[model samples]
Target: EPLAIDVHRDANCGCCKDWIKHLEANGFKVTDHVEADMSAVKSRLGVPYSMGSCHTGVIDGKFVEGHVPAADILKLRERADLVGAAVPGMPVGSPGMEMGDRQDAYQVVGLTRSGQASVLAEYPGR
Candidate 1:
């Protein structure tokens, strides 16, 4: 089955829209919700500020914070045991966080509700 994704973002954030577009381009069935208060939404989802971004998503029972790669989200849906994955701050080169010439190395971390996080994947130089 194609993945079902729910994206929550600030109503006027363009980067969040681009991130949703990226997910759709990667074949996820995305349902987007534009909220007036994104900080409240993030707080309700238990997303840490350090792991926060312009958007948040929930797939099946797992959560995704920031500009998570579609491939990683698909893998999490397939695993069935993971609680979620997070990209943390907006790193250059990550999906919608892209900018010309500059690139920042970043790691996608998998986490449980208990707050245990483990490195899941790393994206190197631009």
Candidate 2:
């Protein structure tokens, strides 16, 4: 993959940037589309409105929504069946939302257009 993760987010959203930092720090590259129309981006990426988050990610030909862990993204690349993965809103304990001592527990939802939301990963706490 080596980056190529196209990140579409509002420029003023630090949470979105923070998430991108996690991706970059983890040896990923990205095209940060700051101050963009997030809703439109989400639609283009095939992110269902129900699963949308603060930022939308189009990476390696797959759509990733919310602050999903980088690990899941790797798994997404290999899963030829899934349309994408979404964290659904902002979870405090999630990778990008990590601001120390804040762990709100969350789940990575494997998004599918066929009305199937597989639980890819679950975090009880931090």
Give TM-scores for every candidate, taking all chains together and pairing residue i with residue i. Answer: 0.89, 0.91
lDDT of 2 by residue, 2-104 (tens): 7578887887888888888988899988788875688888877778788989988877788989998889898888887788999998888687687789599
The RMSD of every model to the true structure, in order and in angstroms, is 1.6, 1.5
Best by lDDT: 2
Q: For residues 75-114, write the lDDT of model 1, one tens digit per residue.
A: 7777655677889878888888788887899888887657
Total backbone clashes of model 1?
0
Best by TM-score: 2
Q: Count the backbone clashes (under 3 Å) in each candidate.
A: 0, 2
> At residue 38, what lDDT does model 2 achieve?
84
Candidate 2 Cα outliers beyond 4 Å, as residue runs? none
